[PDB]
Design a protein around this ligand. Structure first.
Ligand code: HEM
Ligand SMILES: O=C(CCCCn1ccnc1)N[C@@H](Cc1ccccc1)C(=O)O
Ligand SMILES: c1ccc2c(c1)CCC2
Length: 451
């Protein structure tokens, strides 16, 4: 099975020593095909890029979520949070059972008001820009998604729209993600040259924890009951174990939720807006839906649900640029992938989601084309062709949350503003552990529809 270029005893790893690893892996997948072996010092994985192989990798009886090395280093501050837990860790299923009810569509009804609060701030920010002033979309979308998660996660207002510099927690979080990412390429981590990087990391860990732990201490001491995630975690009992989440895990979940609602959802929104400004027909179509559906000053939960084409737009953005572009799997037992690639128990797989979503055998040759109409009816989408939210029980618990928020804000965006790609913006995808269109800027001309 094919393997990309090697670097001596570093094997393929230097390939990831790049600003854009996911995009690097995508061009490799284009070159080598539906599967290529990727080796690193003391590490081997197989990057899947075809729906044919990924539908099998997505067989949960055969493959379980693996923690990529990224998630393992993110586990250093997300602990046994849902996303950095192994399926077999008691806390995963515990936290999964406790939180699944907090992430359903019906759960969204409760979060809708808080999402709108933040969404209106975004709209008001843009309403208040001066002529010829532009929007830094990614930046503003991150302000929105991070504040949405804060408010919805634990009634905390990061007030990102009141800031140029991010909240101290977010400075530490983003810094720890960068350390986690950087340390994929670190051969000798204990080298003194990384003393301060590691000290900085422990500073960032100790920072996020104390700040999140206090918020949990604040809530439990005040004894107040909001309708946010944190209430559900303080009061939730895992029906299986019967146990509630202990404080350490709740904190890990909060940190987990804050990261997932940071640049991962923000990315979708930024990619969506990019594609909408690059495809005005799509924009017109989405904006006319937003105008037809969002007939009230502030969107209702039910109106957001009726933003079908906006959801299609989001799905098509998720197709071309899944902002969580990969998830790792391991073979629970000896198995053969596709009848071609024998896998031993424990062998690791990587689902290169952007590449899957470019599977011409599933979507046709125009995979690069942004056409939300691909998602007119989800029944036309084959099993496991579209996995921007992962797979099975380890799929994104926050998918409904992310889509409701993104549809909401996008709907409101299209309702209240005509958008101009005033720079003929050249899509430049910055890669952290998520994808975002770097330097994506637009001008938003208010439609002068009051809020
Ligand atoms: C469009 C935005 C989002 C995308 C594309 C996305 C994508 C994904 C993907 C692919 C996974 C599976 C990861 C894996 O298997 O390793 C996942 C897991 C997860 N996501 Fe999201 N996600 C998004 C938004 C959110 C938000 C807003 C939250 C906030 C709660 C969230 C929370 C989680 C959690 C907790 C997991 C782990 C679930 C589990 O393992 O049980 N995500 N996400
Ligand atoms: O798999 C992950 C973990 C992060 C992306 C997956 N992700 C994000 C949110 N949820 C899941 N990276 C991919 C791509 C990559 C490689 C090196 C450095 C950065 C990114 C890989 O390992 O090849
Ligand atoms: C990479 C980076 C961050 C996160 C994931 C993957 C899933 C949870 C949050």
């Amino acid at each position: 099975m094919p393997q990309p270029k090697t670097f001596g005893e570093l094997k393929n790893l230097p390939l990831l020593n790049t600003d854009k690893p996911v995009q690097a892996l995508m061009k490799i997948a284009d070159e080598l095909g539906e599967i290529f072996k990727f080796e690193a010092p003391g590490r081997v994985t197989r990057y899947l890029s075809s729906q044919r192989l990924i539908k099998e990798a997505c067989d949960e009886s055969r493959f379980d979520k693996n923690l990529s090395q990224a998630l393992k280093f993110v586990r250093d501050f997300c602990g046994d949070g849902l996303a950095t837990s192994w399926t077999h860790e008691k806390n995963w299923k515990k936290a999964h059972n406790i939180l699944l009810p907090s992430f359903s569509q019906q759960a969204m009804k409760g979060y809708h008001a808080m999402m709108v609060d933040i969404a209106v701030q975004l709209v008001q920010k843009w309403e208040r820009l001066n002529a010829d002033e532009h929007i830094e979309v990614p930046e503003d979308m991150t302000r929105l998604t991070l504040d949405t998660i804060g408010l919805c996660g634990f009634n905390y207002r990061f007030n990102s729209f009141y800031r140029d510099q991010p909240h101290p927690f977010i400075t530490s979080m983003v810094r720890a993600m960068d350390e986690a990412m950087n340390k994929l390429q670190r051969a000798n981590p204990d080298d003194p040259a990384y003393d301060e990087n590691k000290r900085q990391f422990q500073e960032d860990i100790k920072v996020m924890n104390d700040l999140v732990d206090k918020i949990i201490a604040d809530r439990k001491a005040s004894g107040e009951q909001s309708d946010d995630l944190l209430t559900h975690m303080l009061n939730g009992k895992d029906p299986e174990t019967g146990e509630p989440l202990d404080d350490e895990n709740i904190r890990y979940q909060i940190i987990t939720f804050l990261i997932a609602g940071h640049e991962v959802t923000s990315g979708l929104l930024s990619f969506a807006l990019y594609f909408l400004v690059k495809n005005p027909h799509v924009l017109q179509k989405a904006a006319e839906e937003a105008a037809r559906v969002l007939v009230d000053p502030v969107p209702s939960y039910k109106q957001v649900k009726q933003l079908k084409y906006v959801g299609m737009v989001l799905n098509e953005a998720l197709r071309l640029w899944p902002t969580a572009p990969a998830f790792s799997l391991y073979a629970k037992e000896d198995t053969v992938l596709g009848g071609e690639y024998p896998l031993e128990k424990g062998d690791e797989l990587m689902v290169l989601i952007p590449q899957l979503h470019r599977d011409k055998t599933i979507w046709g040759d125009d995979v690069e084309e942004f056409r939300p109409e691909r998602f007119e009816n989800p029944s036309a989408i084959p099993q496991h062709a579209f996995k921007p939210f992962g797979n099975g029980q380890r799929a994104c618990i926050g998918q409904q949350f992310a889509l409701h928020e993104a549809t909401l804000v996008l709907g409101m965006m299209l309702k209240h503003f005509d958008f101009e790609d005033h720079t003929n913006y050249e899509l430049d995808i910055k890669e952290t552990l998520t994808l975002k269109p770097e330097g994506f800027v637009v001008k938003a001309k208010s439609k002068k529809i009051p809020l």
